[PDB]
Symmetry: C2
Amino acid sequence: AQLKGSKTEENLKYAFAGESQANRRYLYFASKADVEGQNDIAALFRSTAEGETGHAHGHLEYLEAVGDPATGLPFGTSRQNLQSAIAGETHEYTDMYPGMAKTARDEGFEEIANWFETLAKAERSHANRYTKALDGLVD
Amino acid sequence: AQLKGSKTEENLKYAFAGESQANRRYLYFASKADVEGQNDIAALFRSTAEGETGHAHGHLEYLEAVGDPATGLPFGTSRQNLQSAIAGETHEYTDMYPGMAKTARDEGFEEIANWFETLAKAERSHANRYTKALDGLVD
Ligand SMILES: [Fe+3]
Ligand SMILES: [Fe+3]
Ligand SMILES: [Fe+3]
Ligand SMILES: [Fe+3]
């Protein structure tokens, strides 16, 4: 059985997305506990978040055989990782965030539209900086 | 204009998932660069990952108006955050990971199936620990 094209590949991608979101959510929850003074709860959310990091890393290790869950491109070496990062960032600043900004404007969410435009600009900066790093990579 | 039910709500949920995965991916790429000896590349992946943390944070702040992207439940206070964490974890250990392990075993991925069962047990641990924290919460 080959993993590529299987239902298990799809489950690995979905589980990777869920573990990734769980780490971000739990760190957000930790910050809210911090401000409240619930320092024991904050520490618990932070420790659980590290568990989700280990889970996500494991899912990615299996995905190395089929490709980056964000781009479909190969990953592993620093050259491949930079190539995939550039591809994904380029999609985000040429397509994803500008399109979301337009929709938010159209629906009347002007501040959220401005947020999406800020992020389009930020991802363009990330893409350009990775491209410079790839140009200088000695491997 | 109300965010709930809009295309912009869906876009924020999708962007939150993507930024969360970008941080996890970039930290994975940094760990590969670490081992290779590409320390400048590793530092760049880690710095960019902190950018993605800021983006995911901001997406979550807008989603507070409509609910946790993983559960639909309200979030903000420690009591709300713990209830949402418990709900998400309970689904992972009762439904998601056991179902993924079965599909993996059927398709002949025995190691991946065992991985999914390890994570079902881990998420049950997380769920029970959050339940005990919520029972002791003094707010
Ligand atoms: Fe997990
Ligand atoms: Fe970026
Ligand atoms: Fe970002
Ligand atoms: Fe968990």
